[PDB]
Amino acid sequence: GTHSHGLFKKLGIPGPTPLPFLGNILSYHKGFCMFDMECHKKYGKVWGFYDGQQPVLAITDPDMIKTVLVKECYSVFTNRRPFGPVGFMKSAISIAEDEEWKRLRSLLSPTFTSGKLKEMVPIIAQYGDVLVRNLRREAETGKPVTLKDVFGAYSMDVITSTSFGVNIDSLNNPQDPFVENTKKLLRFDFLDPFFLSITVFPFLIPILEVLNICVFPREVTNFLRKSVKRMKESRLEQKHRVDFLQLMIDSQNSSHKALSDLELVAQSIIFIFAGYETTSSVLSFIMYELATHPDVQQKLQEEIDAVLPNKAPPTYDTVLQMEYLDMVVNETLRLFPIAMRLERVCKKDVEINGMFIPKGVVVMIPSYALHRDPKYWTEPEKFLPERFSKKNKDNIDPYIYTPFGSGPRNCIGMRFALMNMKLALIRVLQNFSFKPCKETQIPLKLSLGGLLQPEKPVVLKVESRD
Amino acid sequence: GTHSHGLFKKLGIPGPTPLPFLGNILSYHKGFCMFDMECHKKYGKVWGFYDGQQPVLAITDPDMIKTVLVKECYSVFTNRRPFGPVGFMKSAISIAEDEEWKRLRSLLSPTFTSGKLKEMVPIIAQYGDVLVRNLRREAETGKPVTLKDVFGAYSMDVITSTSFGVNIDSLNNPQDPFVENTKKLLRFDFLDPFFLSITVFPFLIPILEVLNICVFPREVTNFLRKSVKRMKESRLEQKHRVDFLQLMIDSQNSSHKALSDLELVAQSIIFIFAGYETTSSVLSFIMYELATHPDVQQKLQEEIDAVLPNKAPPTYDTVLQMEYLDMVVNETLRLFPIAMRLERVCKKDVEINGMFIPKGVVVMIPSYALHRDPKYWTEPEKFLPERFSKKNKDNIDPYIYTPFGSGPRNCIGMRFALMNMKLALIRVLQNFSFKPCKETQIPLKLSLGGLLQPEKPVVLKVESRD
Ligand code: HEM
């Protein structure tokens, strides 16, 4: 059971002492981040622990992080850690490995250029307006509002229209087929009973594969897989060139093997999976900060109105202008980096920056811990957007602050996500103010589980500026 | 169950139609070779079948074989197929993979040069003489003799002295610790109940790994592992530079990481495993041919006496002189290539000689089938050493005849095995003649199992030329 539990004392690396079979996992009872902050305090700049028998080497030196994330990414640190029986989703770009990942990343990169994002702004923006109508009635009847649902509704609407050109009011059609299935594509909690069992019985993943058991619900994937083959074959026979689905079909008509029909479906799914709950999550987090910091919220309302007088519609170019807006988004992602950790598997035996790392270790960068480290962040607990002001932004290490990771395997959806969220916040603050309620959790607490989500759902009062 | 059972009809490759879950394995009831000869007849030059869910692509074109075995060996076709829970023997060179194999092959290659083989001739040759004394009494009492045991005894004696400098008469000490354990290192029958179960439940290999269950008996490996660490640490404090163990310890004192103490032990074991039963097997096969072809046996006796008049001792240089001897050994290996198949896993998607081979297929070369194909071999069923005469040897394709495989991953022990066997045959035929018995199986039949061994053990009369 302790087959590899002696690796780190042989390399001279400090770490919590593992129990047989379980390794160190019992320390996840306070969750990944508190586990990581404490390891960082106690042991310093580098340390090791075991997810069961899997060695994991944490690193916090910005120079070493750059080597892993960008420098020898293609040679050594190309893939993330496996996490469960994925079925055909093995071909999704976030899951794919090595050379099929390089092929997939090269084939999907043009889809995320600012040119294609700029053509999608009018569609996203339309659901800014749907968000106001849905929120205008939730404020006109002064009931406290549950951000997650009003923002979930919004993220969903952006997802469906931006990926498949299906234009629905999900809040007012929670019965529609497309919103019924995507609502069940929730982020994975790697500390829940199932995924923890996997960590302690990783030898069970092939068994589950052979029974067609999949961490992606076997029925939503089927619905989308037929919906896509329905969309295509129909789409064939107009506007087009509007959504992701369309940009992907058109790349199947160009030195890399064009996406297969099934590779295509896999990417459509992973984009929905990445964007839906994450986007609503951060949007909830941003408003909680703006409600508990109404000076910040007001300074943002003023910047919105200066750029967009008369509740003028936001555009691509006006979004990129708004500097306080950018500052607020980044500072909310500092305190709540939805990822918590970045990881790569060490493909070979390598020495980086003076440290032998053996094959098969997963190297982990603990983003949440670095975003809250005193050694880089004055008053790290405080929501303080001025740290990203054009005056101070230059004294922040891009390898300490990595809300989207770094290097060739960074978030491919960063520009989109950033714009998507910004367009929401503008149209919302153009029409509304957000005040705390008796029911609001202040200060907010993070869950002890595996997702970076609030303990209790964020609820706030919302009054019409009108 | 039929997840991948449609791969070959998509590529247009012909093959027997697989059953769900089992693939094609029920056709192994007549064994690998008869399965392969029939596939070769029916489907031609290329075909596919499934060991359970594992696709296997057979190839018989000599040009394509060269690409796989030598040309793109390092890039694409570097590793053999996994076959069971191997524990620490994962570090043995025949099992090791990719870059650790390249390192291990480079670190062990000097150990098998003709210079080191030439220093080992006097030790091997000594057990030529032990073989005569043991056989002289088995013939002086005209009891039919069981080749496998008299040759097993011999192979064992060569193994122990050549690898560890332990000099025993195993036939006359079948109670000694070293002969008790190595006698249990028998070749694997991949058609036996266990290894067939593995093929149909390959998802069970990790499970067995985690229980420390190993196809290498957990106790013989331990005995040798302590024996080696005993040998060393003792060996330290004279002659030395005699056996494999010694050449390996000395390479631990030189751009490749010198063998670890455990890597070393693993290689000692695999050499014993490769050499012991195989050497006795072919030696049994050669004598069966010489008994059923006493003209051939006589022509060989005459060549031995011409080179070595007066029963003169064989030496390295005299062995390499003996051309009929070489011819007999090669022709016995044509009819009984102990390997049956050569295999490599296809690491990437590749096109070789006009054929797309997808990642993960194991490419198989069916040696037994090629050694008996009429299209290259006139009278292929007949034991006819003249096909390797200096007159006809040049019309034999080295990729059809591959008793040791070909390319950088060929048998590293070929020169040794060839000399080892030749030294046995000289001293034996110098003193003895081998005649059939009523009890001898004529014609010999091969087993329907997974090892290329005779149905019933070869038994023959042996008379002293003295
Ligand atoms: C607030 C919004 C988002 C955040 C903070 C975020 C963050 C991240 C992070 C931290 C990673 C790992 C980066 C690394 O390993 O170096 C990642 C990867 C990825 N993200 Fe996002 N993401 C967001 C939204 C999106 C959206 C809207 C998409 C839509 C397609 C998306 C698609 C992906 C993909 C496909 C990957 C894997 C890239 C690869 O392996 O090549 N993300 N993201």
Ligand code: HEM
């Ligand atoms: C009649 C005697 C022998 C025969 C016919 C034989 C045949 C073979 C064959 C057919 C292969 C596979 C080659 C390939 O995949 O291309 C092989 C590999 C190998 N043989 Fe032998 N062998 C014999 C004796 C020995 C002996 C005495 C040793 C002693 C060390 C040995 C060690 C090995 C090793 C280590 C490999 C794997 C090489 C690698 O993967 O780098 N063999 N042998």
Ligand SMILES: CC(C)(C(=O)c1cccnc1)c1cccnc1
């Ligand atoms: C799950 C997925 C696809 C992922 O690759 C991921 C997310 C955070 C950290 N590491 C990997 C993701 C999820 C949400 C936003 N972006 C990406």
Ligand SMILES: CC(C)(C(=O)c1cccnc1)c1cccnc1
């Ligand atoms: C089992 C082992 C080590 C092996 O690598 C092998 C043998 C025949 C075909 N393919 C691989 C072997 C066994 C006997 C002689 N040589 C090598």
